[PDB]
Amino acid sequence: MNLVLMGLPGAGKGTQGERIVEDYGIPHISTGDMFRAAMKEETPLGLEAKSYIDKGELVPDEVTIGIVKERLGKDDCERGFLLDGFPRTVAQAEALEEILEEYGKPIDYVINIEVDKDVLMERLTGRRICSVCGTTYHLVFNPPKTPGICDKDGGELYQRADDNEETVSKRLEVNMKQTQPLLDFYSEKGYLANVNGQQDIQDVYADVKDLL
Ligand SMILES: Nc1ncnc2c1ncn2[C@@H]1O[C@H](COP(=O)(O)OP(=O)(O)OP(=O)(O)OP(=O)(O)OP(=O)(O)OC[C@H]2O[C@@H](n3cnc4c(N)ncnc43)[C@H](O)[C@@H]2O)[C@@H](O)[C@H]1O
Ligand SMILES: [Mg+2]
Numbered sequence: 001m002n003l004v005l006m007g008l009p010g011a012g013k014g015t016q017g018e019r020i021v022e023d024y025g026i027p028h029i030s031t032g033d034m035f036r037a038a039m040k041e042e043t044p045l046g047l048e049a050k051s052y053i054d055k056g057e058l059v060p061d062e063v064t065i066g067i068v069k070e071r072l073g074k075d076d077c078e079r080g081f082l083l084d085g086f087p088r089t090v091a092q093a094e095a096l097e098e099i100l101e102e103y104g105k106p107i108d109y110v111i112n113i114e115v116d117k118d119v120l121m122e123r124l125t126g127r128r129i130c131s132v133c134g135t136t137y138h139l140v141f142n143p144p145k146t147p148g149i150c151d152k153d154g155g156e157l158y159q160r161a162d163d164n165e166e167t168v169s170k171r172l173e174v175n176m177k178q179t180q181p182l183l184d185f186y187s188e189k190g191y192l193a194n195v196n197g198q199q200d201i202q203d204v205y206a207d208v209k210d211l212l
């Protein structure tokens with residue numbers, strides 16, 4: 001099961017991805033999560049990406065395509081994987097097509113999680129993420145059982161640095177204007193399937209579960 005989960009910032013890609021990878025036993029590959037892990041370790045990669053991430057802008061395709069190419073080559077991606085947040089530009093999608101062609105692991109489905117921008121904005125200014133596993137929570141829509149700590153490992157929850165109102169605005173704009181070409185690319189390939197992300201976790205996962 002080779003899957004790509006797309007959708008604007010805050011649509012629930014990570015939330016749905018965790019559930020999918022838990023039920024299918026495949027790697028959850030988030031370019032955003034890989035970047036932040038690189039930032040925490042202070043790797044040369046993290047420093048480079050941080051400049052763009054902090055401003056809400058896209059990290060250059062060269063670097064982004066490069067890390068995904070490497071990652072998708074690992075043995076854990078042999079019988080499936082879930083790409084989250086990649087590709088988010090047509091150039092990345094075309095590069096991905098060739099990369100998977102070479103590995104012999106073409107995309108099965110491209111699920112787009114559709115959510116109104118107003119909803120997106122509220123989901124981002126009330127989000128808290130775990131400092132050890134990256135899972136996310138929402139103070140209103142999906143709060144941690146114990147305020148301030150991750151339900152799973154118990155790590156402290158924090159507000160992502162790029163979740164500040166000003167940056168949330170830039171991110172939404174930056175990504176909205178890239179959707180049309182991406183949706184057109186995948187509708188053309190015939191991998192595209194849309195889902196109404198404006199429901200409760202279970203319903204969205206329910207609408208997703210049926211497909212897979
Ligand atoms: N391919 C690429 N190319 C170039 N640059 C790249 C790149 N990939 C990454 N980058 C760089 O990295 C940056 C950060 O990347 P990334 O981490 O991928 O940022 P993002 O695109 O902004 O997406 P989000 O993680 O914020 O949202 P999500 O859809 O996963 O939502 P979540 O499930 O947490 O949910 C959000 C909130 O909503 C809540 N929620 C989830 N589902 C529901 C629901 N059904 N109902 C109500 N609330 C819900 C959650 O609890 C949570 O609080 C980018 O801005 C860019 O700079
Ligand atoms: Mg995410």
Ligand SMILES: [Zn+2]
Nearest residue numbers: 130133150153
């Ligand atoms: Zn955690």
